[PDB]
Design an enzyme around this catalytic site. Sequence first.
Site, mmCIF file in Angstrom:
data_model
loop_
_atom_site.group_PDB
_atom_site.id
_atom_site.type_symbol
_atom_site.label_atom_id
_atom_site.label_comp_id
_atom_site.label_asym_id
_atom_site.label_seq_id
_atom_site.Cartn_x
_atom_site.Cartn_y
_atom_site.Cartn_z
ATOM 1 N N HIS A 283 -18.334 18.717 -28.348
ATOM 2 C CA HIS A 283 -19.344 18.224 -27.413
ATOM 3 C C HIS A 283 -19.326 18.924 -26.090
ATOM 4 O O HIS A 283 -18.327 19.545 -25.711
ATOM 5 C CB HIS A 283 -19.164 16.724 -27.192
ATOM 6 C CG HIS A 283 -17.742 16.320 -26.898
ATOM 7 N ND1 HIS A 283 -16.879 15.960 -27.866
ATOM 8 C CD2 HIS A 283 -17.044 16.241 -25.693
ATOM 9 C CE1 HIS A 283 -15.689 15.663 -27.313
ATOM 10 N NE2 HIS A 283 -15.792 15.835 -25.983
ATOM 11 N N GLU B 285 -6.106 18.356 -32.663
ATOM 12 C CA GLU B 285 -6.089 16.982 -32.170
ATOM 13 C C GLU B 285 -6.814 16.078 -33.160
ATOM 14 O O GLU B 285 -8.004 15.783 -32.992
ATOM 15 C CB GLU B 285 -6.728 16.853 -30.786
ATOM 16 C CG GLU B 285 -6.360 15.557 -30.078
ATOM 17 C CD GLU B 285 -7.567 14.766 -29.595
ATOM 18 O OE1 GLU B 285 -8.710 15.267 -29.666
ATOM 19 O OE2 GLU B 285 -7.371 13.625 -29.141
ATOM 20 N N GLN C 288 -21.447 12.779 -22.891
ATOM 21 C CA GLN C 288 -20.831 13.738 -23.817
ATOM 22 C C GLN C 288 -21.656 13.828 -25.099
ATOM 23 O O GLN C 288 -21.649 12.899 -25.916
ATOM 24 C CB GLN C 288 -19.378 13.352 -24.131
ATOM 25 C CG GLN C 288 -18.354 13.937 -23.169
ATOM 26 C CD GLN C 288 -17.092 13.101 -23.053
ATOM 27 O OE1 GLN C 288 -17.156 11.879 -22.945
ATOM 28 N NE2 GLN C 288 -15.938 13.758 -23.066
ATOM 29 N N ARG D 237 -6.803 4.544 -18.825
ATOM 30 C CA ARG D 237 -5.945 5.713 -19.053
ATOM 31 C C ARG D 237 -5.500 6.366 -17.746
ATOM 32 O O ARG D 237 -4.482 7.065 -17.705
ATOM 33 C CB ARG D 237 -6.644 6.751 -19.938
ATOM 34 C CG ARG D 237 -6.824 6.332 -21.386
ATOM 35 C CD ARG D 237 -7.631 7.364 -22.155
ATOM 36 N NE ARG D 237 -8.976 7.531 -21.599
ATOM 37 C CZ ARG D 237 -9.862 8.439 -22.003
ATOM 38 N NH1 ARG D 237 -9.563 9.290 -22.977
ATOM 39 N NH2 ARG D 237 -11.053 8.498 -21.427
ATOM 40 N N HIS E 220 -1.825 12.271 -22.057
ATOM 41 C CA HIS E 220 -2.841 11.872 -21.082
ATOM 42 C C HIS E 220 -3.682 10.730 -21.591
ATOM 43 O O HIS E 220 -4.393 10.074 -20.825
ATOM 44 C CB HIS E 220 -3.720 13.062 -20.719
ATOM 45 C CG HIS E 220 -4.616 13.517 -21.842
ATOM 46 N ND1 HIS E 220 -4.155 14.203 -22.907
ATOM 47 C CD2 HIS E 220 -5.980 13.360 -22.037
ATOM 48 C CE1 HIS E 220 -5.172 14.466 -23.743
ATOM 49 N NE2 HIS E 220 -6.291 13.954 -23.206
ATOM 50 N N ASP E 221 -3.601 10.477 -22.893
ATOM 51 C CA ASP E 221 -4.382 9.418 -23.519
ATOM 52 C C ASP E 221 -3.581 8.148 -23.775
ATOM 53 O O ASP E 221 -2.350 8.130 -23.680
ATOM 54 C CB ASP E 221 -5.008 9.905 -24.835
ATOM 55 C CG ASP E 221 -6.362 10.579 -24.638
ATOM 56 O OD1 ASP E 221 -7.145 10.158 -23.764
ATOM 57 O OD2 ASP E 221 -6.658 11.528 -25.386
ATOM 58 N N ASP F 141 -9.884 20.160 -29.594
ATOM 59 C CA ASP F 141 -10.209 18.802 -29.189
ATOM 60 C C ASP F 141 -11.116 18.121 -30.209
ATOM 61 O O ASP F 141 -12.104 18.706 -30.667
ATOM 62 C CB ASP F 141 -10.885 18.823 -27.821
ATOM 63 C CG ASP F 141 -11.122 17.434 -27.269
ATOM 64 O OD1 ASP F 141 -10.142 16.775 -26.870
ATOM 65 O OD2 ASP F 141 -12.294 17.004 -27.235
ATOM 66 N N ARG G 48 -6.058 24.158 -27.950
ATOM 67 C CA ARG G 48 -6.022 22.775 -28.412
ATOM 68 C C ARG G 48 -7.413 22.397 -28.902
ATOM 69 O O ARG G 48 -8.345 22.243 -28.106
ATOM 70 C CB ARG G 48 -5.556 21.833 -27.302
ATOM 71 C CG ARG G 48 -5.558 20.358 -27.678
ATOM 72 C CD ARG G 48 -5.251 19.488 -26.472
ATOM 73 N NE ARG G 48 -5.460 18.059 -26.707
ATOM 74 C CZ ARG G 48 -6.637 17.436 -26.626
ATOM 75 N NH1 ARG G 48 -7.748 18.108 -26.339
ATOM 76 N NH2 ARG G 48 -6.709 16.130 -26.843
ATOM 77 N N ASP H 156 -14.835 12.071 -18.130
ATOM 78 C CA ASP H 156 -13.754 11.883 -19.097
ATOM 79 C C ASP H 156 -12.575 12.790 -18.724
ATOM 80 O O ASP H 156 -11.987 13.458 -19.576
ATOM 81 C CB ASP H 156 -14.252 12.132 -20.531
ATOM 82 C CG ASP H 156 -13.295 11.608 -21.592
ATOM 83 O OD1 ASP H 156 -12.311 10.919 -21.237
ATOM 84 O OD2 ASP H 156 -13.532 11.884 -22.787
#
EC number: 2.4.1.4
Length: 628
Positions: A187, A328, A254, A509, A392-393, A286, A284, A144
């Site tokens: 995760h 996020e 994950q 992506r 990035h997503d 996540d 950040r 990922d």
Amino acid sequence: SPNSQYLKTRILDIYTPEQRAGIEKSEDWRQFSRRMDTHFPKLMNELDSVYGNNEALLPMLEMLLAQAWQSYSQRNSSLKDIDIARENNPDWILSNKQVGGVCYVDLFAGDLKGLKDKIPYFQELGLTYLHLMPLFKCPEGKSDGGYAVSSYRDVNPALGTIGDLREVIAALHEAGISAVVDFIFNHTSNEHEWAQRCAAGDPLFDNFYYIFPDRRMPDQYDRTLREIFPDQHPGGFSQLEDGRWVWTTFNSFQWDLNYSNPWVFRAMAGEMLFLANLGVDILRMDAVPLIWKQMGTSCENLPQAHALIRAFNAVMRIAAPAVFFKSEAIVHPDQVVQYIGQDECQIGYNPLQMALLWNTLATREVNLLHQALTYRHNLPEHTAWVNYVRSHDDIGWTFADEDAAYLGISGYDHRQFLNRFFVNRFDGSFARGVPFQYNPSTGDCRVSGTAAALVGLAQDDPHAVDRIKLLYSIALSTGGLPLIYLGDEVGTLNDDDWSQDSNKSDDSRWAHRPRYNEALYAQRNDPSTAAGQIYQDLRHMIAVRQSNPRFDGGRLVTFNTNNKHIIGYIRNNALLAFGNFSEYPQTVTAHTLQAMPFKAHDLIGGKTVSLNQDLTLQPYQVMWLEIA
């Protein structure tokens, strides 16, 4: 329940009477003790609300605070200065001086040594804030893109060593740039020590994840679980080789950490303290919404999730005051804001504004954007948005159906159109995007592609460059910390060769994750090239933003332009911004402008603008009008 004083005297017990007296008189302890007094009650209250009368709560907390003290003791004195500085300036995040960027270390600059060489470029661009994409150990191949962590301490060998990472942070700090890294706390990868040991049945790692004997609970949980990556697996569970099932919200490699175990919190609070001491300014957070599970619920945005992040906040208030959180939460707007708070996440991504920027380019109509800016922009004191154009997503269309219904817009239908439009399956579309995670049972779909590919630069649409300038102007001027997806400033297009790579073929992506384009960066000073046009425009807007105090803070007031194609808002009662989203000239009438000064200076074009007559904006023209 214990108290601050009690736990302080038990923390001191590791020293013999002689050392103890020296420690209690010291500067480091004085500050730690003071901060313990101020912030421990919040920490206690938040953990008590999650764990209650759990037998492990007291000893976990004593162990945690023992490490908090060690961590703050070791903490470099340069960082303790920033601790005191930010402690006395909570609003540093809200300054118009802040302009942020984000990049992959490998894709943008090869490795960490190369990234350090790019710091003069960041200074040239005006960056005060740099988010570096996941840096630490991750399995070979599919990971990922770094978000499946195999070791929170071992830096990716392809990026360099921990020593290189420290040099980077130090060099960034010298240049007046904050260092921003991911805190991937929901995760780990399936190859993480904790994962292996948990699954092996090691009692030390009992309940570090959610592992079930069969489909009984998975099936019951899956009734109310959203599907993030439907292409990988259904629901939220993946099967191990031995037939057992594990919680996997994202990819099967994950595994969701089990926060119902107070030792998982301690574990992750220990990792947080390590990152703090590297000199990270902003973590950040996540996938914030997923850290708490409960049968019958969506296992997103649960009360305990918010409580736990506020517990993490208190740990930083005690042991690393400089460290701020970036939430996020890519979810419903009502839920997005609940993470943003001085005692939770000081800042957070603003997916609502971002998704509507793109919506408005597609529809030419500002309605939803206006609605969002009118009712959902302002935040509590000492908090800010991270405003962005791309990331990035993929893009998700995360506007509120309830909001859109007030405007007579069907949420479902509108997302059908948006998805079709941005993947070039609607007549005359300027966008060149790629589908991401189309779900046939829900009708949902997201969009991949760079900013430049989605505005039409790939086919050299004459309006492309102006669309980028328009989008970034709003991210730069609404109020909040603007984040530039590095590469956007030279109009970097898609990596069209993403899908023939078998490590990337199932993840679109990667299309908007291209390498450093040397050709475009070579053109940045050439006003005849698109790369140069974009670069000078963005640089100019960054310059204006940072030097003009009318952009300061995060508050705005919308101005009704009375033209459905033109956005309008005011900053600090002194800066009036207009943004034309039509590809045709559009007018704000003299009637509408009656309350405004007769003339006003436009910081975009540099010209004086007469406001006592009709104002016709060029296609996609932006104006920043000094009205006071």
